[PDB]
Nucleic acid binder design. Structure first.
Ligand code: K
Ligand code: K
Ligand code: K
Ligand code: K
Ligand code: K
Ligand code: MG
Ligand code: MG
Ligand code: MG
Ligand code: MG
Ligand code: MG
Ligand code: MG
Ligand code: MG
Ligand code: MG
Ligand code: MG
Ligand code: MG
Ligand code: MG
Ligand code: MG
Ligand code: MG
Ligand code: MG
Ligand code: MG
Ligand code: MG
Ligand code: MG
Ligand code: MG
Ligand code: MG
Ligand code: MG
Ligand code: MG
Ligand code: MG
Ligand code: MG
Ligand code: MG
Ligand code: MG
Ligand code: MG
Ligand code: MG
Ligand code: MG
Ligand code: MG
Ligand code: MG
Ligand code: MG
Ligand code: MG
Ligand code: MG
Ligand code: MG
Ligand code: MG
Ligand code: MG
Ligand code: MG
Ligand code: MG
Ligand code: MG
Ligand code: MG
Ligand code: MG
Ligand code: MG
Ligand code: MG
Ligand code: MG
Lengths: 155, 119, 73
RNA sequence: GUGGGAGAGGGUGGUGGAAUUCCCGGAGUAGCGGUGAAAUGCGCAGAUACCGGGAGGAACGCCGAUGGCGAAGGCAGCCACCUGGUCCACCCGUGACGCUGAGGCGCGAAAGCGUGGGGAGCAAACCGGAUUAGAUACCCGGGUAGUCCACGCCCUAAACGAUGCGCGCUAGGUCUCUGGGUCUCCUGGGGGCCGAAGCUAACGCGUUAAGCGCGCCGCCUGGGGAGUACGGCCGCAAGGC
């Protein structure tokens, strides 16, 4: 977007919990445009969150998403002819996007048989501070702040 | 082991490296640091963050001698001068004054070709 | 633009060629030992040209400094 | 002529501080330096950074400028001596004594040559490190002649305002240096900008003329060959006319 500022799309609220973050996670799970299958996967995963954890799955989901959000990342920049890894903060929308994308990607990396079990286990582990998505967050916050010397290339 | 408790701080900041020497009020040094004392080896020494690390390391080395209040002296126009200033400013050490004492000649010696088109 | 004050207007009757009067020539030096430009002194070409040599005389005599150290940077 | 003025104008001697390098000492530890990134290099024989003391050479920060001086090259710390040019006021003196100027003579940045001295920084050549397809370069670490001084040569240049010198005439406005005066301003000399008439191929010039005139000297006659060859003069040579 060069001319305008590219305003953000407003998502419809969730049909169960009434949260737009849940709908965004549904969309990140969605594949080939199958909304019903993605919602089936996510709601069965919510059914798995209970009877495994006494807490309501909405709280677990939100706390896991909060645990996956990275505070700083690192972008490449061409300076003086070379390419440097410059660390800089992250806007909240990009925090949410990276959190949900990493949740889905790390969920599909699990050895669990069907999807709902994968999403449920990944959400639980990310809520209690482990899993592949938290590993991704830690790796990003390592790369960034591992190149602190380039912080004056913030831009 | 001297227990100085008050001294001076010289900051030699250049485009290639920033180096901090903490001395006593008579000028005799106690400890020191630079970008090379920290793990940085090449051009990363002429970095404001490396200057901050060097300033904080020299300050912590001066804490062993039980020093509290300092007098900062700046020499040289280099990247990371003000960063070392702000590093020493809030580092447990009390900064009493900041003085720029960059040695400027009166057109005495001919500079290298890198610094020519002047005198 | 140096709108703070002019050294000539901030002073009265004085000799420009007196190299021994320190308490007046100190006002014409900057925070450093440097000689102030025309915008700060508010003098004319002839006045400035005389002030330069008189300040240099006072410097060689040891009354005025060649250079000082900046504070509070 | 008299009375005043401004100036890095020139020559000689002396003198001041900042900085660089080196040495001595103190303190002090593992690197400094350098680059796009590096390496050569220097560092445990103690560097870099810091403090003090000492030696030496070279150039004069701020003032400082679109400024000033000189015929040009060119001239920049300060003081003293010697000395040139120049401008203004008085209307005092001589009474055309004027202008230009082929030759001649002198001056003439830098580089270069000779003899002797000096040599801190910089730095052709050169020794290395990089970069590159190669790098006899740009970049980095060293480094000799030289840069500096005395005396004597060398005569070149984008030696440039790419505009020879002098005089008279032809709207002004503005900035500035420097005198004088009835000191809002006027008047005189110098340095800039914009512009009347006019000029110019155009750009542009325009009381600092490239305008209108006059005097005198220099020079041009398509480009390459060529500032070469021959000859002469000059030079120790390089080479110059
Ligand atoms: K080494
Ligand atoms: K000039
Ligand atoms: K010699
Ligand atoms: K010519
Ligand atoms: K006057
Ligand atoms: Mg992943
Ligand atoms: Mg460096
Ligand atoms: Mg003179
Ligand atoms: Mg020593
Ligand atoms: Mg070295
Ligand atoms: Mg060496
Ligand atoms: Mg070695
Ligand atoms: Mg040892
Ligand atoms: Mg040294
Ligand atoms: Mg010393
Ligand atoms: Mg010596
Ligand atoms: Mg200047
Ligand atoms: Mg003149
Ligand atoms: Mg010239
Ligand atoms: Mg008469
Ligand atoms: Mg008569
Ligand atoms: Mg003549
Ligand atoms: Mg002649
Ligand atoms: Mg010559
Ligand atoms: Mg010469
Ligand atoms: Mg010689
Ligand atoms: Mg010799
Ligand atoms: Mg060198
Ligand atoms: Mg070199
Ligand atoms: Mg080479
Ligand atoms: Mg190539
Ligand atoms: Mg190779
Ligand atoms: Mg020789
Ligand atoms: Mg010119
Ligand atoms: Mg000419
Ligand atoms: Mg003319
Ligand atoms: Mg005039
Ligand atoms: Mg014009
Ligand atoms: Mg016309
Ligand atoms: Mg026109
Ligand atoms: Mg004329
Ligand atoms: Mg022909
Ligand atoms: Mg020809
Ligand atoms: Mg011809
Ligand atoms: Mg020739
Ligand atoms: Mg011949
Ligand atoms: Mg001969
Ligand atoms: Mg030859
Ligand atoms: Mg020839």
């Amino acid at each position: 977007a060069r001319r305008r500022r590219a305003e953000v799309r407003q998502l419809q609220p969730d049909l169960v919990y009434g949260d737009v973050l849940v709908t965004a996670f549904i969309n990140k799970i969605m594949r080939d445009g199958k909304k019903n299958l993605a919602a089936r996967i996510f709601y069965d995963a919510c059914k798995i969150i209970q009877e495994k954890t006494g807490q309501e799955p909405l709280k677990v989901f939100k706390q896991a998403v909060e645990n996956v959000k990275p505070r700083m990342e690192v972008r490449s920049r061409r300076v003086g002819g070379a390419n440097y890894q410059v660390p800089m903060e992250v806007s909240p929308r990009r925090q949410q996007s990276l959190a949900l994308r990493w949740l889905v990607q790390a969920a599909n990396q699990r050895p669990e048989r069907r999807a709902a079990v994968r999403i449920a286990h990944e959400l639980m582990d990310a809520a209690e501070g482990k899993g592949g998505a938290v590993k991704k967050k830690e790796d990003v916050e390592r790369m960034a702040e591992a190149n602190r010397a380039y912080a004056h290339y913030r831009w | 082991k001297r227990q100085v408790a008050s001294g001076r701080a010289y900051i030699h900041a250049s485009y290639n490296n920033t180096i901090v020497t903490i001395t006593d009020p008579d000028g005799n040094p106690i400890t020191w640091s630079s970008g090379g004392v920290i793990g940085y080896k090449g051009s990363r020494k002429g970095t404001p963050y490396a200057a901050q690390l060097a300033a904080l390391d020299a300050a912590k080395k001066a804490m062993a001698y039980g020093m509290q209040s300092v007098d900062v002296i700046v020499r040289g126009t280099g990247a990371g001068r003000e960063q070392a200033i702000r590093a020493l400013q809030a580092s447990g050490l009390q900064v009493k004054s900041i003085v720029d004492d960059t040695p400027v000649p009166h057109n005495g010696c001919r500079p290298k070709k890198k610094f020519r088109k002047a005198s | 633009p140096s709108r703070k004050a002019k050294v000539k207007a901030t002073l009265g009757e004085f000799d420009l060629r007196d190299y021994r009067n320190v308490e007046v020539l100190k006002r014409f030096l900057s925070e450093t030992g440097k000689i102030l430009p025309r915008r700060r002194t508010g003098l004319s070409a002839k006045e400035q040209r005389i002030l330069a040599k008189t300040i240099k005389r006072a410097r060689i005599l040891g009354l005025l400094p060649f250079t000082e150290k900046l504070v509070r940077k």
